């Protein structure tokens, strides 16, 4: 469906003005007829974007109500009402058991539904942001007259007019223009104004001057044009549809959840029906056969687990909110940890998005300035008298000014009225020479010639601030070579000197080096005009050369670029040390893209492209073995004629990849290419041209300050302070939460065994029921909750940023090793500790373990109010039941006591508690509150009716203590083996 939109567009900028009118039945001068425009409206439809059909929240909520655990809990809830129905008909049961348990279980499903619904959130308003880029109104020429109309009423063929400050209402063929410049950052991510004129200037319509696009704005001048595309058919309207239309897809974390749901659901249905038939064979009435099944359901399903996961995710997202990293989708909290490839935009993401002075060439020396936002570098020069001469030209031969009321904000961050290069120079001098306004007050400008297309230079004449002179100084800047052809002397370390071929060659060298760094280079020179030839009232003519512009003194060079953000180089290296592949994907030109790649460490030192090898060896590129080149730089124009299989080969064959001059669909294609190889991919960006890529990414991260509204709609995560170091933190947090989820899951599952085994022995042994159904819910929904959550606050056991990204095909959240430990080893020890306390309670009340076998028949018989114990005493029905429920209560408390040790062992997968310590305060809180809850549930009056919880005698609490301790020792010995031999036996069997 969207495969059409993933392709490069076709256009009609090649046609003549006249020819273009024939195609759209239009007038170049009079414009369309009121009738013809209305006709075309009904024909083509409105100049608007329609949002894609969404899934209502209704269906979204209910889709969770049927995912494995909820299905089993539904079967339980209904099976409760089943047994209740069968009762209400047969023998009038005045009880509330099956009825209430059926109500409780149905509530558990609904509430669990809210948790998973909260986790599976999708806040997407892509198409809405795009719609915000179409103006409310447009100016059209109809019947030879200009009028403002609803922009939706704009059709292909009419004559539209735009001027500085307004949004392009539709894709236009420029037919007339006067000084028109446009901001195409929507399509390129670059905000430098692009001229628009009627002349065709490139085969590529996205590069030609005679096309203006919807989603962009006119920055200055005026233009008229013929509408060629409207609504969804515009270049960026298609990007809108592509972006808004892209299928979301399941996250890595989501896939893991479903996976263990299958496992646990599997064992649940297995043991469920495996013992349902095992009971009927033993001659159990279907009346009972279902009651046992309900218990089996409740025992096997970890009722509180899915909600635990959600809370652990939420708490991890809260910590990241506190580092200026907003998470829109709870699952995106983990994806960053599983990320193996980052596709990053350059401008406004890796870079500050601001022309900044990078180097200066004066005194036959290359000086480097500090490009960082917060200025974390050092000085270059202050002493040289040459510097002050260059500094003066940079301030004086400059027409840029700071906007009013910025004195509060830092120099480099403040808004400037002017072109990017003049702003850069302004901020450079203001920083290291103080107030520039002061320099422009001490040296009043009397005449100037602003930068001309033809002159290729800008000159200014000022009254020298010096009192002993107060004469006229000439300054000029422009193209380095043009400035050179106008110089005779060079200000070396203070004093001038003739411009010999020697210094002239050093100039060329300096010029070539700076240009090689992808930096824009300017020349600077001045000339102190002779006093006798220029009186204090001498008039200078700016129109006609009234003053010399030759034999001037060359002062120096200055170079500039849109530099990396301070934290970016280090963040890139850190991603790469964690084994994450970092690719650059930018709408910017290749020379600039490549230079920043080396600056931030995308391309490491020494690595070459095929073009680099060819130039170094002075040989044809076809003569170069492409396998000798680990780095590559792909232009979008070449990308366009490559198949995906060939794109896949590029991705496979290079470690250091730069995709430059890419369109928005091309970014999507590169992302998909990476994913196709089985990689989890993150995208980082800030422009509307990142929207499709951000949507398709497993996780999209947008910049918060510099980011466009669209990009932040398309993302899963926002960096609110533009701190790229947050990606590094995000991946670290993502890995940590992945491990801690394992700990929390194992902990929760472990207590399933002591809830399953009592029901089994109840059938096979014919003893009184050791633990009840209600009692199980008091564990999974009550006591285990805070402890399970607390594992989310566990510190790393080792340097997680030192390991490679997990293999999502092999490294699962829940594997066989977890089940073996939780179900086969620790849970089994917990089961016994439960049974022990059960036998203790009964034996101390007169029913010794031996006489318990095959007694349930008489025990449950409501009409036998005289059962004989081991000592020959006789018990009524309600009397023995009180002891039985007291057994449920102590078995319950036994679970809590054995979960103490389990909580401590689940703390660490490898390390010892004596190494990791007990610095998790939430965990300790869990221990205290868990025990408080259990005690309250046993001793609070009335709980014997609502939950069948009975007061325990002090000695009862200590039954499971020896089992709780064996768990601690056992797991500590086991992990001691793991560490002592990384070989594999204990490791490959039990290492979560």
């Amino acid at each position: 469906l969207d495969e059409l939109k993933k392709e490069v567009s076709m256009d009609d900028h090649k046609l003549s003005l006249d020819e273009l009118h024939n195609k759209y039945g239009t007038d170049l001068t009079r414009g369309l007829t009121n009738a013809r425009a209305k006709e075309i409206l009904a024909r083509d439809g409105p100049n608007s974007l329609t949002p894609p059909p969404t899934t209502p929240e209704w269906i979204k909520f209910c889709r969770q109500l049927f995912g494995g655990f909820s299905i089993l809990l539904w079967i339980g809830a209904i099976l409760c009402f089943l047994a209740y129905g069968i009762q209400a008909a047969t023998e009038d049961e005045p009880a509330n058991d099956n009825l209430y348990l059926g109500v409780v279980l149905s509530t558990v499903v609904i509430v669990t539904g809210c948790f998973s619904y909260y986790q599976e959130a999708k806040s997407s308003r892509i198409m809405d942001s795009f719609k915000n880029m179409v103006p409310q109104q447009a100016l059209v020429i109809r019947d030879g007259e200009k009028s403002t109309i609803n922009a939706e009423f704009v059709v292909a063929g009419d004559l539209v007019e735009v001027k500085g400050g307004d949004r392009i209402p539709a894709d236009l063929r420029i037919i007339s223009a006067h000084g028109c410049k446009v901001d195409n950052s929507s399509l390129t991510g670059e905000s430098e104004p692009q001229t628009r004129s009627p002349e065709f200037s490139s085969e590529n319509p996205l590069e030609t001057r005679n096309i203006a696009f919807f989603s962009t704005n006119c920055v200055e001048g005026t233009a008229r044009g013929v509408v060629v595309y409207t609504g969804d058919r515009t270049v960026m309207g298609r990007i809108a549809t592509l972006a808004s239309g892209l299928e979301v897809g399941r996250t890595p974390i989501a896939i893991e959840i479903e996976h263990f749901i299958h496992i646990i659901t599997g064992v649940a249905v297995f043991l469920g029906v495996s013992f349902f038939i095992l009971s009927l064979i033993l001659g159990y009435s279907w009346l009972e056969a279902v009651i046992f099944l309900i218990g089996i359901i409740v025992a096997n399903v970890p009722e509180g687990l899915l909600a635990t996961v959600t809370v652990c995710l939420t708490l991890t997202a809260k910590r990241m909110a506190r580092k200026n990293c907003l998470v829109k989708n709870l699952e995106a909290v983990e994806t960053l940890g599983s990320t193996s490839t980052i596709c990053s935009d350059k401008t406004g993401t890796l870079t500050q998005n601001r022309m900044t002075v990078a180097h200066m060439w004066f005194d036959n020396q290359i000086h480097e300035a500090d490009t960082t936002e917060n200025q974390s570098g050092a000085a270059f020069d202050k002493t040289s008298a040459t510097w002050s001469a260059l500094s003066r030209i940079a301030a004086l031969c400059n027409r840029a000014v700071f906007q009013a009321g910025q004195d509060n904000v830092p120099i480099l961050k403040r808004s400037v009225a002017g072109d990017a290069s003049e702003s850069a120079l302004l901020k450079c001098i203001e920083l290291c020479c103080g107030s520039v306004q002061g320099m422009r007050d001490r040296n009043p400008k009397i005449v100037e010639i602003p930068f001309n297309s033809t002159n290729k230079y800008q000159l200014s004449i000022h009254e020298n601030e010096k009192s002993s002179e107060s004469r006229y100084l000439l300054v000029m800047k422009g193209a380095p070579e043009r400035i050179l052809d106008r110089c005779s002397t060079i200000l070396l370390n203070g004093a001038e000197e003739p411009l010999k071929e020697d210094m002239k060659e050093a100039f060329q060298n300096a010029y070539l080096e700076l240009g090689g760094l992808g930096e824009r280079v300017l020349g600077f020179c001045h000339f102190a005009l002779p006093e006798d030839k220029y009186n204090e009232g001498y008039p200078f003519d700016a129109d006609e050369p009234n003053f010399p512009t030759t034999d001037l003194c060359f002062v120096g060079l200055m170079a500039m670029i849109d530099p990396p953000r301070a934290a970016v180089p280090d963040a890139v290296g850190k991603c790469r040390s964690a084994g994450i592949k970092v690719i650059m994907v930018t709408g910017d030109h290749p020379i600039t893209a490549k230079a920043i790649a080396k600056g931030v460490g995308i391309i490491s030192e020494g690595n070459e492209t095929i073009e680099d090898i060819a130039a170094r060896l002075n040989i044809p590129i076809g003569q170069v073995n492409p396998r000798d080149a680990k780095a590559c730089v792909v232009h979008g124009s070449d990308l366009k004629d490559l198949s995906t299989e060939v794109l896949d080969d590029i991705l496979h064959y290079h470690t250091e990849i730069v995709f430059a001059r890419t369109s928005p669909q091309q970014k999507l294609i590169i992302v998909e290419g990476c994913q196709r190889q089985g990689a989890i991919v993150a995208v980082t960006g800030d422009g509307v041209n990142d929207s499709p890529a951000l949507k398709k990414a497993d996780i999209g991260v947008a910049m918060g300050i510099s980011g466009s509204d669209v990009s932040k709609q398309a993302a899963d995560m926002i960096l609110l302070d533009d701190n790229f170091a947050s990606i590094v933190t995000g991946v670290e947090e993502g890995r940590l939460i992945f491990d801690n989820l394992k700990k929390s899951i194992a902990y929760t599952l472990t207590s399933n065994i002591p809830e399953i085994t009592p029901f089994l022995v109840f059938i096979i042994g014919n003893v009184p029921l050791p633990l009840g159904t209600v009692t199980i819910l008091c564990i999974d929904l009550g006591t285990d909750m805070v402890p399970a959550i607390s594992l989310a606050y566990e510190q790393a056991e080792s340097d997680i940023m030192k390991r490679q990204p997990r293999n999502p095909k092999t490294d699962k959240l829940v594997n066989e090793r977890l089940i073996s430990m939780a179900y086969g080893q620790i849970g089994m020890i917990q089961a016994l500790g439960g049974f022990f306390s059960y036998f203790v309670i009964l034996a101390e009340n007169g029913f010794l373990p031996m006489d318990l076998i095959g007694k349930r028949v008489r025990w449950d018989d409501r009409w036998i109010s005289d059962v004989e114990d081991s000592f020959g005493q006789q018990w009524t029905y309600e009397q023995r039941k009180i002891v039985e429920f007291t057994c449920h209560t102590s078995f319950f408390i036994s679970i809590v006591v054995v979960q103490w040790a389990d909580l401590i062992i689940c703390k660490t997968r490898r390390n010892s508690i004596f190494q990791q310590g007990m610095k998790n305060k939430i965990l300790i809180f869990g221990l205290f509150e868990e025990t408080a809850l259990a005690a309250f549930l046993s001793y609070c009056p009335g709980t014997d009716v609502a939950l069948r919880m009975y007061p325990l005698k002090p000695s009862w609490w200590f039954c499971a203590f020896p089992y709780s301790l064996i768990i601690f020792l056992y797991d500590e010995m086991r992990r001691f083996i793991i560490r002592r031999s990384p070989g594999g036996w204990v490791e490959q069997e039990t290492y979560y």
Partner: protein
Amino acid sequence: EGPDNDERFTYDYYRLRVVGLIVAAVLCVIGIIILLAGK
């Protein structure tokens, strides 16, 4: 005692409950103290 051994079939479940609830409360307070050591 002999025929007056009524205490043999008696248990102070009332005191046990009072003590049990005291303990539960104090464990609840102790927990808050340790948690609130930083919030």
